[PDB]
Amino acid sequence: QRAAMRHPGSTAVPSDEMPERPDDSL
Amino acid sequence: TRALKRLKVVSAFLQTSNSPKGMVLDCVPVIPPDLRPMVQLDGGRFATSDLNDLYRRVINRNNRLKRLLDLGAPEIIVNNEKRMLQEAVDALFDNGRRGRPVTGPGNRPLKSLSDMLKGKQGRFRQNLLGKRVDYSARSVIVVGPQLKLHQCGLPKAMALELFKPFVMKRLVDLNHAQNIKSAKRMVERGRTVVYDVLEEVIAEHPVLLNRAPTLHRLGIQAFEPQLVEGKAIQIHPLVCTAFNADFDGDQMAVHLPLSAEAQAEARILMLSSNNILKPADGRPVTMPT
Amino acid sequence: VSNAKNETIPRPIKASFREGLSVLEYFISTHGARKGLADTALRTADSGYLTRRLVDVSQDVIIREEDCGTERGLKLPIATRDADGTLRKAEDVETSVYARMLAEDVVIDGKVIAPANVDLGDVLIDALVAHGVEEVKTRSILTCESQVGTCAMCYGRSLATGKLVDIGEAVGIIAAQSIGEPGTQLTMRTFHTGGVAGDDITQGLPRVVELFEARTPKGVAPISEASGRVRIEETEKTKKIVVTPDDGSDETAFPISKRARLLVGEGDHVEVGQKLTVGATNPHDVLRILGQRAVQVHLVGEVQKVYNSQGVSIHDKHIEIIIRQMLRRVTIIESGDAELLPGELVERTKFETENRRVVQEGGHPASGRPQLMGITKASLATESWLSAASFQETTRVLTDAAINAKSDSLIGLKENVIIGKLIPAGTGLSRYR
Amino acid sequence: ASTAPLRISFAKIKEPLEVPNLLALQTESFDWLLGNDAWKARVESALESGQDVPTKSGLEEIFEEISPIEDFSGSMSLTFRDHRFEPPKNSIDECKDRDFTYAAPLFVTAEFTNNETGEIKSQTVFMGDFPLMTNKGTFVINGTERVVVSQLVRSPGVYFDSSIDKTSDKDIFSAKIIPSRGAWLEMEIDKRDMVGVRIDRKRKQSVTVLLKALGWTTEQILEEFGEYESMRATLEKDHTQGQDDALLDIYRKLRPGEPPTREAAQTLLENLYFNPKRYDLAKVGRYKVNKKLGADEPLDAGVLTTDDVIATIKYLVKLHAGETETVGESGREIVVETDDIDHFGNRRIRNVGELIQNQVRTGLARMERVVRERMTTQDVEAITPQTLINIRPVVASIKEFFGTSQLSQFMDQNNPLSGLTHKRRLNALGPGGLSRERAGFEVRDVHPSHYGRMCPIETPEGPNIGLIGSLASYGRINPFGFIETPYRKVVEGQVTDDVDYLTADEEDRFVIAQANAALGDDMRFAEARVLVRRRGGEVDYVPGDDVDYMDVSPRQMVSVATAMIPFLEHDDANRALMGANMMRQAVPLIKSESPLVGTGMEYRSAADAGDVVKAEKAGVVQEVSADYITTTNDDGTYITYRLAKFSRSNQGTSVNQKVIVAEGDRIIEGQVLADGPATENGEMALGKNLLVAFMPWEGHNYEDAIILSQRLVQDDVLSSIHIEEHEVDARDTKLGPEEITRDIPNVSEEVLADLDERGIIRIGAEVVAGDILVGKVTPKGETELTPEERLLRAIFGEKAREVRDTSLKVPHGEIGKVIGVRVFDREEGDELPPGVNQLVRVYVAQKRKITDGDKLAGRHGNKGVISKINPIEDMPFLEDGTPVDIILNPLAVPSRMNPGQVLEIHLGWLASRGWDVSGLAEEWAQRLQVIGADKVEPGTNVATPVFDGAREDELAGLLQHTIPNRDGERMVLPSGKARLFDGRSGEPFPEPISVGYMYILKLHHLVDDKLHARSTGPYSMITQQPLGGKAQFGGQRFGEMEVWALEAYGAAYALQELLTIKSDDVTGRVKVYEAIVKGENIPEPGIPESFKVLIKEMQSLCLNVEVLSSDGMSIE
Amino acid sequence: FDELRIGLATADDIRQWSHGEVKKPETINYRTLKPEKDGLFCEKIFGPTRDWECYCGKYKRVRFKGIICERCGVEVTRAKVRRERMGHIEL
DNA sequence: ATGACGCATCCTTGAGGTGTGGAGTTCCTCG
DNA sequence: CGAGGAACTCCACTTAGGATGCGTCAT
Ligand SMILES: [Mg+2]
Ligand SMILES: [Zn+2]
Ligand SMILES: [Zn+2]
């Protein structure tokens, strides 16, 4: 519980990771 | 039969310089992170790939078992941990092949290394055959019967931004733009000379009109663009049997080639003033109807 | 219009869309509209899948050679139907023979009528049919022999140009797309039962699916093995037909269900090649007994049946491309002398070359027997594992390639579009480069 | 409330029952759930009227179920009790404009008690903040509106299927029992005469093995069922005997590798099948099972019994035997026959309240688990209900449902009708229902069980045909979950006034008459042959005395968003479907006006919706000012009706309200004191009336297109107004807190001239693409502080600004003018997650006029797109000079199969130039006179029923006898056509033309948003390809079929050009643009990056892939 | 680029493939948003996410090209080198 | 205060979900 | 080794995040 719920930003979302991440290389 | 099949596998092991010593694995490699990365989603969120989680858990089990056997614990727990490590690697390489696939936050199964490749949404039939391209506009189609057979009408906005580079070439060449950034500025701001140069550049530039369900060869063709007003693409009225592009509010895609070699091929083999003949049964397709 | 669950309405709609319609007739009508909409929606992607299969198979069938020089050719009936003795043109000449050029100098009365290596148009055909012929011989792919694949003159003229096929034309994709495109337009289903089932073979796109994949017809009829005296040995538990083929040939017997619609009589005579009961004959069976020409004719006729009964017209060159690419491999029997395992369904080319090599070394050759598979199996039976990996069965074909440790050269259009290098076809052929 | 604009009625048949409420489907269910006073009033009304309603509230049952929770010993116990509600801390508008939610706290009087102590510690604890609905029927959540749809999922119980095995060529049968919560049962027979049972989806087991596992054995198997041969053969197949042996072997097979014991098998079976805490057989499920199997009145909320299993065995074995009728187990005569799937006697409707109840039940069970853990842990006589109870699971469940589920979904607020139909979707998709692919084609098709409960015409046009839809107009959800239908009863050959409610199965038990069947002076139907209906879509007539029921309204099967079409009996199924689908994406218009031709579901469909403001108080108005209409009642109270003046909707349209009355008027209850968007005088107003002339004209209308007149660019007849939004906010970050200030680093004064000191543009100034909306900046930044640059800065001696502009940015491709601004901060009691400093919500509102390329349409699916715009004189003109407004291609009318628009056009003209039938003495004249719609002034809008509209000869005669323009100037010929001149040349066109007036919509398929092109923009990360998406300046999907096309054409270089350089790499993408901007020859292609990731992933799987050349490693 | 051939691999082959190993079963720091040692996304084993920079403090300058840091074990290389470097677990 | 450490509270138990369809095939248990 | 025949493997594929164990080491 203290390993996960503390800053529980770790989300294994596949459906909103490849389209939602821009590319720095122009 | 049981002899021959076994014997062909043995045959595969006869000449090949391989060694089945590697058919049982003492290690497992890990993909680089940029191909399975995490990102800082707003609100402190961290969107992570599933393969990241699978590698995390198998590494956890590896560490736990190595530390347990570092001291020599009783064999039952050691064997249980070994079989759990085996099962973890099994799920990693193919989560759904054996047993209940391992899930993540929701009830949906995670994705293994043998799921990001196969299937329609993998790599082969999703990312290598067809790669989404630049200089590729789309808009609504309206019939115009004031066009030569080799002609199409294109609104001024899509023309401004598509041919923007050639437009810039001519503004710089005409010395309207002292520098390239000034050329950017006048492209964004818009002047009468800008549309004049756009009308100039649309000439002698075959443009590949295209529709979505390209069922036959005569589904993508070339045309010559004329700068029509409005906000819709304009089409000849006897190519709407090749594209099957009827006006129920449909929409049409338009592409542009970059190499002058592509321009020559598009004006020779593609241009719809020569491809009057259907490719199936010989008969002309672009005839009055 | 068809009633619910593809039944027949026991009352028509007695009016048009102008006079006036009550509401229950509109409700009845919308059944078929919804059904057809669903058919269109799914058949879009289904026909897409079928053209994917045919594109995978019919790739690398691009012409490379200009000429081969054969005299062997296909024999085509050019003008049938002499009911009143009049020699007049046949109806389907346009898709069968037309644009298929000539090889010989056909002579009827001591004078060359149709010269050699000339396009077979219409005026020459009228001259020939006035002369009195009922046959012609043509260069074709189905009989062409070449060291580098297929030559130009055997095909003919590209229908989309009228001029002769340019050497290098990617005929394969043209054939695949040509066959695939009208697939969306077939949409002809059994909307009314009519008190018939089972015997009604799959109709429309499924028929092409089945015939290009070499699967046994659903109501596959048995095929005759050898000519001779046939009779019935039916049993209440199993109906059975037994034929003793004459001239010292072993009896052949086939069991059939109760409902058969048998087209063969009791104690009658059968031919070496002919049907036995209602139902499409398996292509394998007609390959077994009647060599090659009979099976090519059967396949072409059966696919053209659906295509030209729907309403769309396609020249048979594309179908014959498909069939020549399908009927390719040979199973091997008595294989000990040739130093290879029996079976394995090996190709014609390497089989003939290696038997020739062993005969040169002295060993007698190993017997062979041609066999035809489906488009999918042939595609995944490739010699370049990358194309089969791209097509389907990625993990399986991957482990085949991993065990067998095979390698793929740059042969293949799809293998070349994956890597992203100039494909050798149309214009990318090195001859123009 | 008969206070509507006059619509002269062309109707011919009245109705017994007018249209009931349109949005009861949400409000009544939620009243049942929360059980407010309206629920109690409705319950008393149902009781005194003896109707079918849920007697007890959802939350009361849900708290009763989980109430008596105790430990292993029963020492300490917790028990909940009745429910109470407290008014909200917010208002609806407050919630909407302050990012709050419509929440209300819930109270329960919990109790803690010790059996040995005898003390009861009664207490009251708040059960969190439950969400409520508005009067409309929606649900306000997180600053937006939402709707929970009705559902459609197969009911629970038993299902008999008769399938065919192909290889064996045999008739197999399968009884699949789908319970509510537990595990499914499968019972297969006739595979080899070996009846068997499969459980948990594993290998099937002989039935008698489990029949021994229960209290049955071989002896009574011989005694009772010793008559059906298949069961006897199965008994021959039996091997083991004894209940303990049965339990042993079943626990062996279901749980291999574990000690098989009596306790283990007994516990497993009783927990999985006979435990009402894990197997909560549904009330609907129990009722259906009882009626199916004859189990008369068991425990209504019980679990399965062995009696049920033997009943299933009896049903299956008799189905094998072909027995027709049987005596139900503890029941009477019932039928034996296999069952279908998609008949609505097998699908159930989960309403809103049942959904919220289910999720709250999950939350309550989780809270019970935690409470049980703690109370088992906690010391005795030192705990209170306020101490051991943490309702965090319940709140988590509520938030989970209202934020994550796929049944709480957005509203569609283009117009009132969009929402009105959105609250009536019978969505069969979702969790625990069906799916696109797995579900075949029997579900996706209509069914004779759709005769007034699901619109056969209305449905999405795509993959989902048959999955989603819209409720029929005359619908009311059953408490269990079903659709009742209204009917008018026929008895002894005559028909009574009272209305009846019937569902799918009882509908199938009846014979159904027809709506527009002519009614005689005597109530009994006159004609001897009456065209009625029968079971399963069996059409047939009856002499008349044997007819049982009849149809109340001929707009029943059609929904409320499709009954508005005029002349719906003169089209094809596809065109009516297309019109229904594409009459619900129409943008509102500034000068919204009711049609000249329509039907009586504009007033009802604009009043029963929400956006129209109504006066619920009889009295006299004092003032009708700009915004606040102030009224004084007969009772003597002052009420300030505020109006929604130019407010935003979900998609970005406008909901602007307007006044209808003056400041000296009397008002009764429920009278429309205003109008919403797309509504005039309290009638739905989607489009406008334009004059049409049917001609081919220069080909500018080739293949179903439309050409318009510039009149409608001056009059602004067809123009709309949209409202975009921007919700920006600053975050505390780690590099100092972000502020919203005018002080944007190093910007010119003109760009921030419109900006305010706080950093928002003036409320009213214009905005165009390339402007700045809100000024935002991060105070600190670690931009460039490497030692070399640090030394350079130290030498320079000037401190550069580390701030960076985080300012909001109006999208490129939009114009507008500000409608309003809202500002919020953490200082106020507003609710905001952490980090966010200042919140700004700026709404922008634009006006658009009709333009070429903007899609248009009509009410009969006669779709099209604007081709070209021409001056007023270019288009033709009639004999008195009036031009024509629109011109359509007459080639589409025959082929597309919709001859139901010509009549609309003719009636529109008839209305627009009023006729005069003052005693023509013709038959049609007498009919139209006894109807009374004979004399009509020039402009009185006409109303035509969807299935009782204007006929033909009446239309022709009306066109013959219109009012002359001058002395004897009856303008158009008596046969529709008109001697329309030619504006272009001047000569009359060779022969007459057909002209009139038609109602044209302006669909949401705009042309500016559609227009889209890309040169260089954003990419993806894992694959270096241009983004796939319309809204993000994406490319195009050059898929595989287009590659096939380019191969077939032989164009090799072009295919390579646009499959490696144009995208999917880095060097090519940069170099094409670079060489272009500096003007050199186009460089060479390269290797795809997709290939690189492919080989890397192949490497990771240990497949030793490598690239080899003729010499090994060649040039890459 | 003339032929494509595949087979199988062993531990020697994988250590030929890879650069390092991984034993810490978790991602980068959630406090300072920085990577770690011997874990996933580790700059020691996978390529540095920040280009012309290293993990600790010593080689953030631009004039360092491809050299190895003395304490954090990161070669100052491309960000795209984070797409090519590889590691393994040894069970 | 978190995310770490160093242990370490006498009665003992999941949870739901799982409604196609197509032929390939190969083992595997029974003639 | 010769039977049924039922698993196993391919292919058709569209929003915000329910905690502790308590105590305290260390910053
Ligand atoms: Mg269309
Ligand atoms: Zn040849
Ligand atoms: Zn360092």
Side-chain angles (χ1 to χ4, degrees), chain B residues 211 244-251:
Chain B
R211 217 181 168 278
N244 192 0
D246 76 329
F247 304 88
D248 287 41
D250 281 321
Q251 190 193 158

Side-chain angles (χ1 to χ4, degrees), chain C residues 68 70 139-140 144-145 151 154:
Chain C
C68 77
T70 181
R139 311 181 63 167
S140 159
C144 180
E145 56 269 15
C151 79
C154 271

Side-chain angles (χ1 to χ4, degrees), chain C residues 216-242:
Chain C
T216 55
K218 150 189 74 49
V220 63
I223 285 78
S224 80
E225 288 76 28
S227 53
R229 296 296 112 66
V230 69
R231 75 279 175 201
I232 191 72
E233 273 85 355
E234 68 91 31
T235 309
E236 207 72 22
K237 69 155 200 68
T238 295
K239 327 307 150 193
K240 166 62 90 150
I241 194 83
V242 187

Side-chain angles (χ1 to χ4, degrees), chain B residues 113 116 123 127 130-138 142 145 161 212 214 217-218 230-231 237 247-248 256, chain D residues 698 702 704 852 866 896 1007 1012-1015 1025-1026 1035-1037 1042 1049 1058-1059 1062-1063 1090 1097 1100:
Chain B
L113 269 169
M116 149 191 177
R123 173 69 35 65
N127 282 61
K131 302 146 279 195
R132 285 211 205 196
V133 288
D134 310 13
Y135 319 116
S136 96
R138 62 188 307 242
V142 290
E161 59 192 353
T214 320
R217 189 186 67 142
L218 262 163
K231 307 297 290 165
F247 304 88
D248 287 41
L256 183 82
Chain D
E698 167 55 359
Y702 172 56
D704 229 336
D852 72 323
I866 302 167
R896 306 311 194 79
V1007 78
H1012 173 197
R1014 184 222 188 81
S1015 88
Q1025 309 192 355
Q1036 278 335 304
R1037 179 75 183 133
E1042 292 68 26
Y1049 268 124
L1058 66 90
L1059 287 174
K1062 216 179 264 180
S1063 99
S1090 195
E1097 203 196 338
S1100 154

